């Protein structure tokens, strides 16, 4: 280069181009994949990440681990982005997508180093991915009977498979059953906000319970609350959005009087307004009063005197769940508290759970919502339990949308690799090398499973290849038996869309990474 007294780009601009740039991008992607490599399979191990403020996060989910990493490499960020996309669309496979994309890049790296044009690799990736998606849709097993018992069994097996990789894998059947029940209680949209998740410190994992109703933590009771009865056998619940306490009528309101009689009248008018609201609530017939807005001490004592329960400052989401469970309506005005706007539940109760008081609304027959109460010895323990249950819930929702399952444990990808190699054997040969590289890269997941489990990956892979060659679509890795087995008969089931989205996202990420030839980094502004 030359000094060029007047430069084109400002000082600090960094430019890298050519084969070395793409090789470096592939290496960075390999590093990112290795960062979450050992979290895959029933023998996977959690990762602990400490942030700047000293908080430690323990997780097995690949998307969370990648997000917690402060990745700044422009090419490496693609893997994090596709992991986040897989988490958003599907909810499971966030570890598989990064491994698949990095394996694609690693397999095509030698061809990049020798000067092969990137567009050929991109075309080969697109063709192979289209063929693999078509094959997955073709060979996916579906039940065209809509049997309730069979559908429930399929959902439970899918939840168990999605859960048998986390710290709650020991109790995977219990959690899977509760997850299936919670999803089935959702009405038509399967909204995630309709499944409350409560974490309470202390207690074993088996102490966690699913509430066929709604439950929330006690919210800053006032004086006289302890005199209210804490159990009702058929209460009517008044869902309100009302501030029940003495206060100014309006922010801009002003009272101008010139007589002490009017002064006393004004004071009595304020008291009578409050008592009129309270009397309307009481005469509505309700026994439990919940409000998003604060409820004052005067209202609390008034409700206590009538053997009635009140709870103010309830979170809005908890009121929505209570409305969906009991079946009432949130009222901003108590002027018309008719019978049809009052929620009903069989049993209301306040009980102590590990040093905290929780209100329970059980016995709802028409509830369209749930509430998970999770017990654990630490807040990170419960956070990881919540993450695992979220993965299971997403899988069960997707299975509810369509019951198309493929056997897991790497069997599906072994079949895909066999099919892609067979296809590649019958083409001219320039694309054959790249399609064979794609098929070889598809073998990473069973190899990673064997490596994590401590097996010998080579022998297991050879046995799997020999089995798939001679017939048998659903033979994967048997982790417990140190061998291979028919994973479909072992009930290791995955929704087909999981692997479909994984392949699609990995292919898109690999194509985007390969297509880039030059990277430019402008100096960062406001250096101060």
């Amino acid at each position: 280069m030359m000094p060029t007294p007047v430069i084109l780009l400002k000082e600090g601009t960094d430019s890298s181009q050519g084969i070395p740039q793409l090789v470096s991008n592939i290496s960075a992607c390999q590093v990112i994949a290795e960062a979450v490599r050992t979290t895959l399979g029933p023998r996977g191990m959690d990762k602990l990440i400490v942030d700047g403020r000293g908080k430690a996060t323990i997780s097995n989910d690949g998307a969370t681990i990648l997000k917690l990493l402060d990745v700044v490499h422009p090419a490496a960020k693609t893997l994090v982005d596709i992991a986040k996309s897989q988490d958003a669309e599907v909810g499971d496979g966030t570890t598989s997508v990064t491994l698949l994309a990095a394996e694609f890049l690693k397999q095509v790296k030698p061809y990049v180093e020798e000067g092969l044009h990137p567009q050929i690799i991109i075309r080969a990736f697109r063709t192979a991915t289209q063929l693999a998606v078509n094959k997955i849709k073709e060979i996916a097993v579906t039940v065209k009977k809509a049997d309730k018992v069979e559908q429930r069994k399929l959902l439970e097996k899918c939840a168990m498979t999605a859960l048998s990789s986390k710290l709650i894998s020991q109790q995977k059947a219990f959690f899977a059953k509760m997850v299936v029940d919670a999803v089935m209680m959702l009405d038509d949209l399967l909204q995630l906000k309709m499944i409350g998740i409560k974490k309470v410190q202390g207690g074993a994992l088996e102490d966690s319970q699913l509430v066929a109703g709604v439950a929330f933590k006690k919210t800053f009771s006032y004086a006289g609350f302890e005199m209210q009865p804490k159990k009702y056998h058929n209460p009517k619940i008044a869902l309100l959005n009302v501030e029940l306490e003495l206060k100014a009528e309006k922010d801009n309101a002003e009272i101008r009087v010139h007589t002490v009689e009017d002064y006393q009248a004004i004071v009595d008018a304020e008291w009578n307004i409050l008592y009129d609201k309270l009397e309307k609530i009481h005469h509505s017939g309700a026994k439990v009063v919940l409000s998003k807005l604060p409820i004052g001490d005067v209202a609390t004592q008034y409700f206590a005197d009538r053997d009635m329960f009140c709870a103010g400052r309830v979170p809005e989401e908890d009121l929505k769940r209570t409305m969906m469970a009991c079946g009432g309506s949130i009222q901003t005005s108590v002027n018309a508290l008719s019978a049809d706007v009052l929620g009903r539940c069989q049993v209301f109760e306040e009980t102590q759970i590990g040093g905290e008081r929780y209100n329970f609304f059980t016995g709802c027959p028409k509830a369209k919502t749930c509430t998970f109460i999770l017990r654990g010895g630490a807040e990170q323990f419960m956070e990881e339990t919540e993450r695992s249950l979220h993965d299971a819930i997403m899988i069960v929702r997707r299975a509810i949308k369509n019951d198309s399952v493929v056997a897991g444990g790497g069997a599906i990808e072994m079949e895909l690799s066999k099919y892609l190699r067979d296809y590649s054997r019958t083409i001219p040969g320039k694309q054959q090398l790249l399609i064979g590289a794609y098929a070889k890269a598809l073998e990473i997941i069973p190899r990673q499973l064997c490596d994590n489990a401590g097996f010998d990956a080579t022998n297991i892979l050879n046995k799997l290849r020999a089995r798939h060659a001679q017939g048998g679509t659903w033979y994967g890795v048997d982790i417990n038996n140190e061998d291979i087995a028919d994973n479909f008969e072992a009930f290791v089931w995955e929704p087909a869309m999981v692997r479909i989205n994984a392949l699609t996202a990995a292919s898109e990420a690999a194509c985007l990474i390969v297509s880039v030839d030059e990277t430019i980094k402008n100096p960062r502004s406001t250096v101060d």
Binding site: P20, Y111, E114, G115, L116, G429, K430, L433, R447, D451, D456, A457, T458
Partner: protein, 532 residues
Amino acid sequence: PLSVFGDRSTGETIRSQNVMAAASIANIVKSSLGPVGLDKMLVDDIGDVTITNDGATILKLLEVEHPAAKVLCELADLQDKEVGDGTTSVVIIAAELLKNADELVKQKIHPTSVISGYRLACKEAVRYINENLIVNTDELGRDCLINAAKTSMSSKIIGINGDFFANMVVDAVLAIKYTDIRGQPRYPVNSVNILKAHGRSQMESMLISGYALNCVVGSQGMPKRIVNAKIACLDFSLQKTKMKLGVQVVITDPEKLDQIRQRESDITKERIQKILATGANVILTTGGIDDMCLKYFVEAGAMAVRRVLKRDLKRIAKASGATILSTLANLEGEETFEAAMLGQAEEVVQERICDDELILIKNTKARTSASIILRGANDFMCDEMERSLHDALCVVKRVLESKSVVPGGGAVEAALSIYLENYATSMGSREQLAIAEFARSLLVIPNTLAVNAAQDSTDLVAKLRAFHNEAQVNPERKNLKWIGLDLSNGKPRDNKQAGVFEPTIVKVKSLKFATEAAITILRIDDLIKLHP
């Protein structure tokens, strides 16, 4: 727990780091391979500039910190020392071997199995090369030497100049040929004095039918051209005689001081008179010569050259038949010089070469010697020409000593890859992968050759492999073993008829050294770096 004052790396981390270092070293010199390779311009951060294509020079000049990179650099240096050619190829092959071996290791293949497979593959490759890929040079003649020199000088600054430089190299090597005991023709390269001087073009560099000294006469008095030279080689200074430490002059009678002082120089005067009385014409000495002895030589009409290099003087004495004389002491305790110690030459001239003068000892009798005067455009070009010339001389020496040559252009590498990937299935269960990876890594040479020419490496290497597979499968197509790479047109070509040859020793030594270096680096799975 260890409480070791240093850093520690263990497992895949250190292995990946070592492979990183080896790959970086390989990528440093990967762009200077093959005829479509290009030179490099090194700056020594004080303004000194070096332009070269030789791998050994590049690796020696670079500053290296990582131990594995140091291993590869020392490997290149050893390859240069023991063979003289293929310094880039051995480094590239070793780095590719290490990369593929680590790729195998990352698949839970034990490094011992990889090392055993590499050893077996290297032995089988050497055996296959010796059995099949060698070509005897007895039936080829001088054309084989010319082609080998031209191939060696490809990728160098004297590439197109090869048509003349190959003839010069062959003549220079053949001039210094001698046969020792056991009747073995030995070619003592590095006895050819290579002199550099900028100025005229490459085409008109001189090959001396004698010897060339980078020295001049000690004084302007003596003539600068003697026809029937009588060279007298001396290993002592011709100066005023000074007594050693153990001798001390003490004078009590003052009348003897003048006699002492006169004798102090009359001793050297008598020595010079004895030397010149036998008819000596040219006097070369390693020591200095002061003014009075120079005047003696001027009056005698002879030549006196001082501060002659010891190796140059030894070569001159051997070529001209003279004998080095560290002293004029015979077995009778006297001080005599006889004509039997005089070496003769057909001419001694002080030629002028680009505003500077040097001494040419033309056509020494009783032995033939050669020297090369390289003419270029500047110092850097002359230095690179000298390096390329040394590479060509080493290649010609290897070809003349061992009479077996192999086709160039990656034909040997492709044949070895095909044969080894076929042979790996013959035996072994886990070292089979190691042998297959050895075969695959042997293809890095034609790949780099194709890349350097901006040709489609995939198609060219695929066609080469198909040709060699047909050669190894069909008995009647065994003539396809010579199918190499023609980088000018980017097509496979029979290199045996094209005249692209390399000594077999180059390939064999490169394979052995690369395999040993890869094995040495592969044994490390833990690094401890103590703080200084």
